[PDB]
């Protein structure tokens, strides 16, 4: 559409063009209503801009502002570009140059390299980085994984405090609560008993809502992590349920299951399952695999809990998931067996979006900062004819840059709580991701479920994982390995695919890298955790992350690629707009569309979730952490769902399921 250039040109007409001067204004800004001087730029970045303004102003190519779509730019304007008394002060390029400086500080070279690549749409950083980079309290991290400090009012309320402090800034929360005693449990020095997790959850629900103040963008939702042996498990998983008593729900928090392998076996073999209070059965969350199964079975023997039929729980879980899309599913044993952080202790949760897998304890709140590579941007014409090449060398090198960025962020970040700073300065985890897999397959003319798409997926993630580990090893040569590197799998030369007992695909030289790593270490304990990318991909104009498209339409967002093809066949007309709306966005079962187009523009409800699960399994061997595997069910059935779960579970997935999106 042409409405983009209209809006963009009109932003230009309402904004100063000299970057140094917009920085000046932003930095000099004063709250007229209050007389308070209210700077939107840090001292150190303001200075840097001033000490370099010529060099900075002239690197900006303001043309690049047009490389956004209408929906894209409006996303930028509505939430991203810094505002002055109600209206937009920053141009897109300003936002970008500002983010670039906030990341690189005095390294003007890097800053310019980041500006360039970002402005050309090669990658982007997560929302909190776009919001806060270069601003006075630069809270750039997206993820915090919080341990419930202790089963006491002090611990509970200390945790709640911490979560409010985190939520207030950017940053979602994954909070694990396995150590909280269940309903009916004994409390010393009183004859009343505990009312369990649900009342305590309602406290967190309430604080989640409170921390959301005005001009909306101080969000940071909560996901809560519970192992399914917890005695309060049946109420826990119903949190988002649409009905029942409004004093037992909690509609702003998300349930996530931290599932041991044992649970799944019990279900499969149609056996028993036992609920415990953490009090009556301590340590369950502080071991995994064999250790846990021994420990668990003993508590079972000792009569410490209440036994039910495993498939009772299972059935309930499926019903919650069907009706609400939750609880999420993440496999505790896959996460622990296959984590480079296993020298730290047992990992007890993932994050808000089920992609982060990092160690947390009461004094250590795991943090991650995220960025995503724009996959379609590495598509190239050959010595033409083809236009059917992916440039894996360019992708390798951008990943290298993004890795160096995410490292800078660790150091230039303002941490909302001391636990987060202690954690991140110690292990320095990082999280690279992607958007536009769907676009990329399409541009290369690959059906999502083809053997070419399957191969390209593998190669892509091999080069990102390789690139990041390489960039990271380089940093460890410059600055030393991260503090806890000694004793990790990676110190032993065990990398992620090794942990899946797989040879890597071999498009890159892993032995040399592995040699270098054992020699020099890595700067980062973890590097890859493909994430939802909701609004960042929207700004870039690409499909969410690594999923197929959900539609070829939307409101009247018509697939650029579909559309191109329809036209190249003339068959696209006016009674053509008519079909893709009347059917929710599918092209299958249309009378006059070439089979090849049908196969290429399969909608995610038309793709086999088995296919989906295989591809996630394929890429997972190169994924350090995990990834946000949404699952989509056509006409959901309890059996379809059970099969889908055990399939990913048996595939060794860490995150078996994020949202269940349905019908």
């Amino acid at each position: 559409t042409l409405a983009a250039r209209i809006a963009i040109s009109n932003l230009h007409k309402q904004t100063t063009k000299q970057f140094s001067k917009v920085v000046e204004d932003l930095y000099r800004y004063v709250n007229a209503a209050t007389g308070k001087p209210a700077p939107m730029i840090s001292d150190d970045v303001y200075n840097i801009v001033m000490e370099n303004k010529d060099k900075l102003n002239s690197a900006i190519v303001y043309d690049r502002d047009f490389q956004y779509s209408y929906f894209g730019f409006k996303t930028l304007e509505r939430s991203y570009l810094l505002r002055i008394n109600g209206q937009v002060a920053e141009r897109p390029q300003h936002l970008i140059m500002r983010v670039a400086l906030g990341i690189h500080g005095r390294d003007i070279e890097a800053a310019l390299e980041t500006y360039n690549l970002m402005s050309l749409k090669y990658f982007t950083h997560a929302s909190p980085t776009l919001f806060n980079a270069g601003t006075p309290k630069p809270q750039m991290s997206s993820c915090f994984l919080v341990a419930m400090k202790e089963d006491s009012i002090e611990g509970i309320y200390d945790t709640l405090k911490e979560c409010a402090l985190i939520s207030k800034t950017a940053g979602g929360i994954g909070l694990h609560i396995h150590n909280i005693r269940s309903t009916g449990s004994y409390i010393a020095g009183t004859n009343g008993t505990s009312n369990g997790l649900i009342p305590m959850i309602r406290v967190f629900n309430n604080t989640a809502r409170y921390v959301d103040q005005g001009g909306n963008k101080r969000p940071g939702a909560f996901a809560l992590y519970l192992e399914p042996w917890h005695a309060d498990i049946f109420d826990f998983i119903d949190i988002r349920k649409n009905h029942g008593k409004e004093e037992i729900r909690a509609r702003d928090l998300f349930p996530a299951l931290w599932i041991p392998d044992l649970f799944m076996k019990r279900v499969e073999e149609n056996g028993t399952w036992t609920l415990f209070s953490p009090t009556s059965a301590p340590g369950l969350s502080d071991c995994y695999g064999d250790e846990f199964e021994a420990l668990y079975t003993r508590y079972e023997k000792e009569g410490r809990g209440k036994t039910i039929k495993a498939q009772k729980l299972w059935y309930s879980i499926l019903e919650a998931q069907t009706e609400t899309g939750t609880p999420f599913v993440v496999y505790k044993d896959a996460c622990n067996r296959k984590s480079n952080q296993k020298n730290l202790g047992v990992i007890k949760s993932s994050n808000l979006c089920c992609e982060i897998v990092e160690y947390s304890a009461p004094d250590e709140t795991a943090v991650c900062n995220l960025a995503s590579v724009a996959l379609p941007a590495f598509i190239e014409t050959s010595e033409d004819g083809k236009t059917s090449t992916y440039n894996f060398k360019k992708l390798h090198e951008i990943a290298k840059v993004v890795t160096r960025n995410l490292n800078r962020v660790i150091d230039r970040n303002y941490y909302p709580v001391e636990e987060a700073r202690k954690s991140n300065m110690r292990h320095r985890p990082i999280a690279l991701g992607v958007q536009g897999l769907a676009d990329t397959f399409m541009l290369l003319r690959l059906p999502f479920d083809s053997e070419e798409a399957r191969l390209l997926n593998i190669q892509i993630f091999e080069t990102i994982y390789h690139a990041s580990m390489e960039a990271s090893c380089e940093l460890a040569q410059k600055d030393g390995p991260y503090e806890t590197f000694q004793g990790s799998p990676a110190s032993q030369g065990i990398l992620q695919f090794d942990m899946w007992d797989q040879k890597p695909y071999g498009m890159w030289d892993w032995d040399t890298l592995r040699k270098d790593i054992m020699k020099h270490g890595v700067r980062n304990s973890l590097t890859m955790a493909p994430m939802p990318t909701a609004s960042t991909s929207q700004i870039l104009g690409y499909n969410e992350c690594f999923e197929p498209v959900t539609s070829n339409m939307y409101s009247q967002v018509v697939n650029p690629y579909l559309l191109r093809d329809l036209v190249d066949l003339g068959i696209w007309d006016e009674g053509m707009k008519q079909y893709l709306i009347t059917q929710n966005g599918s092209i299958q079962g249309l009378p006059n569309v070439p089979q090849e187009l049908k196969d290429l523009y399969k909608t995610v409800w038309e793709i086999s979730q088995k296919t989906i699960i295989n591809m996630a399994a394929d890429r997972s061997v190169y994924i350090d952490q995990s990834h946000s595997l949404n699952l989509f069910l056509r006409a959901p059935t309890m059996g379809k769902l059970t099969s889908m779960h055990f399939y990913g579970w048996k595939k060794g997935l860490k995150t078996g399921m994020y949202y269940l999106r349905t019908q």
Partner: peptide, 7 residues
């Protein structure tokens, strides 16, 4: 309860 279904 089934693990063999079309999905």
């Amino acid at each position: 309860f089934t693990l063999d279904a079309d999905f």
